[PDB]
């Protein structure tokens, strides 16, 4: 089972596409992805200033 | 069966040409194409600014 430890002041989002249900979790916890959730890919700006 | 996971804030459109019916879906879901739906090909502008 794929599990990710969420940072203390961050949040992640996945979706249970089999049951057609969304859920958003926050804080320092682990996300237990059931057989068909996929994390939200956030492509963010970074670099020296920002890319 | 061909299935595509729709992004969280995006939408896709297909058509059931056998039953002559259209449907539009949104949000983070999977589209289950029955034997004769075809996705809408959106050729959009991109490039460095826009092509």
From Swiss-Prot, chains A, B:
Coiled coil: none annotated. Phosphorylated on Tyr residues after EGF stimulation. It is found in: Cytoplasm; Nucleus. It comes from the Eukaryota. Signal peptide: none annotated. The vault ribonucleoprotein particle is a huge (400 A x 670 A) cage structure of 12.9 MDa. It consists of a dimer of half-vaults, with each half-vault comprising 39 identical major vault protein (MVP) chains, PARP4 and one or more vault RNAs (vRNAs). Interacts with TEP1. Interacts with PTEN and activated MAPK1. The phosphorylated protein interacts with the SH2 domains of PTPN11 and SRC. Interacts with APEX1. May interact with ZNF540. Required for normal vault structure. Vaults are multi-subunit structures that may act as scaffolds for proteins involved in signal transduction. Vaults may also play a role in nucleo-cytoplasmic transport. Down-regulates IFNG-mediated STAT1 signaling and subsequent activation of JAK. Down-regulates SRC activity and signaling through MAP kinases. This is Major vault protein. It comes from Rattus norvegicus (Rat). The gene is Mvp. The chain holds residues 457 to 507 of 861 of the full protein.
């Amino acid at each position: 089972v794929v599990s990710y430890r969420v940072p203390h002041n961050a949040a992640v989002q996945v979706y249970d596409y089999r049951a057609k249900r969304a859920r958003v979790v926050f804080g320092p916890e682990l996300v237990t992805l059931d057989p068909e959730e996929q994390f939200t890919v956030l492509s963010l700006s970074a670099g020296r200033p920002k890319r």
